[PDB]
Design a protein around this motif. Structure first.
Motif, PDB file in Angstrom:
ATOM      1  N   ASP A   1      76.109  16.488 -71.353  1.00  0.00           N
ATOM      2  CA  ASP A   1      74.924  16.418 -70.170  1.00  0.00           C
ATOM      3  C   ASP A   1      74.256  14.982 -70.743  1.00  0.00           C
ATOM      4  OD1 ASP A   1      75.860  18.839 -69.630  1.00  0.00           O
ATOM      5  OD2 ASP A   1      73.686  19.636 -69.311  1.00  0.00           O
ATOM      6  N   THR A   2      75.021  13.969 -70.486  1.00  0.00           N
ATOM      7  CA  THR A   2      74.775  12.503 -71.167  1.00  0.00           C
ATOM      8  C   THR A   2      73.808  11.727 -70.252  1.00  0.00           C
ATOM      9  OG1 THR A   2      76.322  10.686 -71.846  1.00  0.00           O
ATOM     10  CG2 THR A   2      76.668  11.383 -69.487  1.00  0.00           C
ATOM     11  N   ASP A   3      73.539  12.264 -69.210  1.00  0.00           N
ATOM     12  CA  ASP A   3      72.365  11.418 -68.401  1.00  0.00           C
ATOM     13  C   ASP A   3      70.989  11.900 -68.871  1.00  0.00           C
ATOM     14  OD1 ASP A   3      73.927   9.640 -66.789  1.00  0.00           O
ATOM     15  OD2 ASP A   3      73.593  10.772 -64.925  1.00  0.00           O
ATOM     16  N   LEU A   4      70.878  12.722 -69.634  1.00  0.00           N
ATOM     17  CA  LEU A   4      69.533  13.607 -70.292  1.00  0.00           C
ATOM     18  C   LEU A   4      69.495  12.965 -71.717  1.00  0.00           C
ATOM     19  CD1 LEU A   4      69.803  17.222 -69.370  1.00  0.00           C
ATOM     20  CD2 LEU A   4      68.307  15.281 -68.087  1.00  0.00           C
ATOM     21  N   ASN A   5      70.572  12.170 -72.089  1.00  0.00           N
ATOM     22  CA  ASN A   5      70.674  11.717 -73.494  1.00  0.00           C
ATOM     23  C   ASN A   5      71.069  10.370 -73.917  1.00  0.00           C
ATOM     24  OD1 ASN A   5      70.378  14.447 -75.137  1.00  0.00           O
ATOM     25  ND2 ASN A   5      71.920  15.013 -73.366  1.00  0.00           N
TER      26      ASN A   5
ATOM     27  N   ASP B   1      59.225  14.038 -72.496  1.00  0.00           N
ATOM     28  CA  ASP B   1      58.625  13.832 -71.374  1.00  0.00           C
ATOM     29  C   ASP B   1      59.563  13.831 -70.004  1.00  0.00           C
ATOM     30  OD1 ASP B   1      58.336  11.500 -73.570  1.00  0.00           O
ATOM     31  OD2 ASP B   1      58.581  10.438 -71.590  1.00  0.00           O
ATOM     32  N   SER B   2      60.651  13.011 -70.538  1.00  0.00           N
ATOM     33  CA  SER B   2      61.859  12.553 -69.427  1.00  0.00           C
ATOM     34  C   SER B   2      62.587  13.877 -68.629  1.00  0.00           C
ATOM     35  CB  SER B   2      62.522  11.509 -69.933  1.00  0.00           C
ATOM     36  OG  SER B   2      63.952  12.205 -70.751  1.00  0.00           O
ATOM     37  N   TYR B   3      62.437  14.934 -69.456  1.00  0.00           N
ATOM     38  CA  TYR B   3      62.753  16.330 -68.862  1.00  0.00           C
ATOM     39  C   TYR B   3      61.820  17.469 -69.411  1.00  0.00           C
ATOM     40  CZ  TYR B   3      66.090  19.660 -66.565  1.00  0.00           C
ATOM     41  OH  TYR B   3      66.672  20.477 -65.778  1.00  0.00           O
ATOM     42  N   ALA B   4      60.638  17.373 -68.901  1.00  0.00           N
ATOM     43  CA  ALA B   4      59.410  18.171 -69.256  1.00  0.00           C
ATOM     44  C   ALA B   4      59.344  19.634 -68.661  1.00  0.00           C
ATOM     45  CB  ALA B   4      58.194  17.315 -69.086  1.00  0.00           C
ATOM     46  N   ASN B   5      59.645  20.719 -69.299  1.00  0.00           N
ATOM     47  CA  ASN B   5      59.908  22.174 -68.777  1.00  0.00           C
ATOM     48  C   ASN B   5      60.936  21.761 -67.617  1.00  0.00           C
ATOM     49  OD1 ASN B   5      59.866  24.549 -68.438  1.00  0.00           O
ATOM     50  ND2 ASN B   5      57.804  24.855 -67.745  1.00  0.00           N
ATOM     51  N   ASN B   6      61.927  21.002 -67.690  1.00  0.00           N
ATOM     52  CA  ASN B   6      62.800  20.593 -66.669  1.00  0.00           C
ATOM     53  C   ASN B   6      62.133  19.953 -65.534  1.00  0.00           C
ATOM     54  OD1 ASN B   6      64.157  22.229 -68.599  1.00  0.00           O
ATOM     55  ND2 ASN B   6      65.620  22.908 -67.162  1.00  0.00           N
ATOM     56  N   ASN B   7      61.472  19.023 -65.884  1.00  0.00           N
ATOM     57  CA  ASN B   7      60.979  18.069 -64.660  1.00  0.00           C
ATOM     58  C   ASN B   7      61.065  16.539 -65.220  1.00  0.00           C
ATOM     59  OD1 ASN B   7      59.326  20.085 -62.731  1.00  0.00           O
ATOM     60  ND2 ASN B   7      58.950  20.671 -64.985  1.00  0.00           N
TER      61      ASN B   7
END
Length: 465
Positions: free
Chosen positions: A331-335, A21-27
């Protein structure tokens, strides 16, 4: 025909959608945050109004078809299609023991109910399909019926274990989760015909003794307590795999980055910097009584500290999912590794209290609604603090229990309190908005009203959009 390995694989693919959800199709569409951004607890924040502009329009009840949450449409209609393949698989299973097939069908039915209920909460009137584009749009009220059909399968007694917090089946869908999803959906639909049934379901969870309230409200959000004795269902977030390029693989969450202060400098070295979205309103701090441990567990007070002040700054930020040193392995800020607590037992108790005291349901299985309410207050203060279980006090306690967990907005909508509570001119923090019944939904995305235009199966835009 289908093997055990195909079913576990189709199912594995269905479950994955929980992590995205937190990067949903890159959103940047963190699921509980898309709710709390329309509550009285938060502002939008970010660099300025137009930094993730659609999030601003969301917060202001001012969205246009052109900038809806297309990313949640994309991941949950994918989640739906994957569930459909996992169920088709279960129905053509051969040589698999009937016990295990029953469980996998129920897990897939829970996941389909879960994904469709988010599409239902956000979009309402959606093209629904059960078999693997050219599909009739059906009304929110019809969708509700589809979800409850799937939950009959998922909630069936003696099929899924009541809890899955340990061993090989940790984080797998459990019967307590299906019953909590059923309560959430029936209560949001206001389907009074099923209030007694969901009150009995809450009693069944309470009487099972398979769940307890964490003594330490603060501690339960630390990674040590991923799957604690209060957790009924949470996303299994692991700190890797998501890339700036693709939000369709990996296990990480951007949420703690999104909502933590820009260039924060914590002398304590516990907390870490983010993008300065979703600052907490002073009103949300102030509502807490002296001694209520939930306040300092829910809200980081950085009013004395060193950080880059961004839009609608208040000094106050969300703690439960705050960015923490360690929770980010290089890419630590997505993880980040922070599991999303989707259902916990506090909700089981408060659902029961509300259905008895607000909705007039008889007590079920000899469970005392006032005692359940007192349990919540006791954990809150670390000591008994009895409070009459009135509508006003139940609404207040739910507010205080779930700050930053995306409950407040939906609760105000279903209570009929959204118009009064969310209509505001908060000029000093650039929050000026009028809630009306049309703002229960967001727009169906233009790009999807486009892909369908001039067909038998044309999508109609939600009222007021």
């Amino acid at each position: 025909p289908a093997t055990e390995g195909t079913i576990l694989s189709s199912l594995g693919s269905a479950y994955q959608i929980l992590l995205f959800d937190s990067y949903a199709n890159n959103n940047y569409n963190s699921i509980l945050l898309m709710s709390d951004l329309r509550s009285d607890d938060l502002y939008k924040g970010g660099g300025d109004a137009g930094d993730q502009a659609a999030l601003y329009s969301l917060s202001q009840f001012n969205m246009s078809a052109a900038e809806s949450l297309g990313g949640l449409w994309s991941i949950y209609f994918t989640g739906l299609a994957r569930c459909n393949n996992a169920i088709i698989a279960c129905a053509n299973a051969e040589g698999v023991q009937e016990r295990k097939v029953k469980q996998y069908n129920a897990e897939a039915h829970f996941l389909r109910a879960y994904y469709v209920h988010l599409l239902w909460k956000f979009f309402g009137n959606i093209p629904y399909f059960e078999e693997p584009y050219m599909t009739k749009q059906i009304s929110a009220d019809e969708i509700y019926n589809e979800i409850m059909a799937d939950l009959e399968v998922a909630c069936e007694e003696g099929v899924m274990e009541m809890v899955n917090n340990s061993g090989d089946n940790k984080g797998r869908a459990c019967r307590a989760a299906a019953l909590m999803l059923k309560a959430r959906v029936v209560m949001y639909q206001k389907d009074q015909s099923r209030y007694a049934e969901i009150a009995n379901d809450m009693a069944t969870i309470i009487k099972s003794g398979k769940f307890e309230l964490m003594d330490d409200f603060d501690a339960m959000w630390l990674d040590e307590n991923e799957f604690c004795k209060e957790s009924i269902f949470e996303s299994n977030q692991l700190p890797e795999g998501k890339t700036w390029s693709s939000g369709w693989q990996g296990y990480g969450t951007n949420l703690p980055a999104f909502i933590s202060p820009n260039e924060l400098n914590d002398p304590s070295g516990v907390f870490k910097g983010g993008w300065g979205f979703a600052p907490v309103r002073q009103s949300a701090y102030d509502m807490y009584e002296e001694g209520d441990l939930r306040r300092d567990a829910s809200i980081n007070d950085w009013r004395g500290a060193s950080y880059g002040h961004r839009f609608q700054d208040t000094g106050l930020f969300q703690r439960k999912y705050a960015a923490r040193e360690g929770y980010n392995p290089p890419d630590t800020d997505l993880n980040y590794c922070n599991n999303l607590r989707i259902f916990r037992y506090a909700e089981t108790l408060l659902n029961y209290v509300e259905l008895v005291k607000m909705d007039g349901v008889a007590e079920q299985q000899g469970v005392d609604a006032q005692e359940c309410f007192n349990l919540i207050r006791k954990r809150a203060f670390g000591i008994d603090k009895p409070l009459a279980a009135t509508a006003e006090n139940i609404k207040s306690e739910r507010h205080k229990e779930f700050l930053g967990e995306g409950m407040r907005f939906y609760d105000l909508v279903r209570w009929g309190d959204a118009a009064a509570v969310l209509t505001e001119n908060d000029a000093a923090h650039n929050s000026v908005r009028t809630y009306d019944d049309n703002k229960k939904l967001i727009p169906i995305p233009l790009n999807e009203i486009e892909k369908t235009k001039g067909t038998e199966f044309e999508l109609k835009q939600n009222p007021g959009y």
